[PDB]
């Protein structure tokens, strides 16, 4: 938590966390000489809700 210190306890905190048991999404891309176009689509252009 932001600049807070908590010491020898448990904390029940509502926050912004991943869902336990979900998977990831590799979006890294290594080019060598060319520069595609299907790389730049809503498959790879993603959403930001929370």
């Amino acid at each position: 938590v932001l600049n807070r210190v908590y010491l020898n306890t448990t904390l029940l905190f509502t926050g912004y966390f991943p869902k336990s048991g979900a998977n990831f999404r590799d979006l890294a891309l290594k080019g060598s000489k060319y520069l595609s176009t299907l790389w730049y689509k809503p498959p790879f252009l993603s959403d930001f809700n929370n």
Binding site: G31, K33, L35, S36, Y40
Partner: protein, 50 residues
């Protein structure tokens, strides 16, 4: 955090040994309007970053 003139097909270039293409995700050499600007540091030898 600034309003940039974003390229259609953005990409980068490794600053160790340069590639065929050039790093060009914007062409904005006129200091555009910015909301935020900062510099942070990390460990150069650490494997995983989150």
């Amino acid at each position: 955090a600034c309003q940039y003139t974003m390229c259609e097909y953005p990409h980068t270039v490794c600053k160790s040994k340069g590639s065929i293409r050039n790093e060009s995700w914007h062409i904005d050499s006129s200091e555009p309007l910015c909301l935020f600007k900062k510099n942070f540091t990390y460990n150069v030898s650490a494997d995983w970053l989150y």
